[PDB]
Design a protein around this ligand. Structure first.
Ligand SMILES: CC[C@@H]1CC/C=C/[C@H](O)[C@@H]2CC[C@H]2CN2C[C@@]3(CCCc4cc(Cl)ccc43)COc3ccc(cc32)C(=O)NS1(=O)=O
Length: 155
């Protein structure tokens, strides 16, 4: 399942980067060039999303009250409720992943880094297992990269 594998790698790397502040230097798996560009795009766009929605993100994090592995496990149900049961577009997919990064950073602050990879797996499961049809139709991660591509300015 290439789409799942690729999704997991991109989402897992971004959440880990966000939490630890360091880039993972290991090579990507299959489709490395696209996964690299997708991660680069997520960085650029996701970092802005977390700031543009700072108040809402903080509000939701407080409401969720995440303390441990049990709370983190409970998040899949909330993601299905809020993300899956709605219109699909790349903006909403970015909010899904960007809030995940926000949560991962919170997990590092409370010294619960071990829950970050499980969280990335949960997000990937929700995204891929509930929106595969849309993802395929939108050209998957190549489409994500194409959608957010910005041309260089003249001069
Ligand atoms: C119209 C702009 C929308 C962005 C602004 C939305 C803000 C919301 O008030 C909440 C702040 C976080 C947003 C809710 N979720 C996050 C979500 C549900 C809560 C648990 C959770 C846990 C993880 Cl680890 C990851 C995500 C979540 C589900 O993901 C999404 C996805 C899309 C939106 C909101 C959430 C959304 O409304 N996006 S928007 O339309 O771009």
């Amino acid at each position: 399942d290439e789409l799942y594998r690729q999704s997991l790698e991109i989402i897992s790397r971004y959440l880990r980067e966000q939490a630890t502040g360091a880039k993972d230097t290991k090579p990507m798996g299959r489709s490395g060039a696209t996964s690299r560009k997708a991660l680069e795009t997520l960085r650029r766009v996701g970092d802005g999303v977390q700031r543009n929605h700072e108040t809402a993100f903080q509000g939701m994090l407080r409401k969720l009250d995440i303390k441990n592995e049990d709370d983190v496990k409970s998040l899949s149900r909330v993601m299905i409720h809020v993300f899956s049961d709605g219109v699909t577009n790349w903006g909403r997919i970015v909010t899904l992943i960007s809030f995940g990064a926000f949560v991962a950073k919170h997990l590092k602050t409370i010294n619960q880094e071990s829950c970050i990879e499980p969280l990335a797996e949960s997000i990937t499961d929700v995204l891929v297992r509930t929106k595969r049809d849309w993802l395929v139709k939108q050209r998957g991660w190549d489409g994500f990269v194409e959608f957010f591509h910005v041309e260089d300015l003249e001069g």
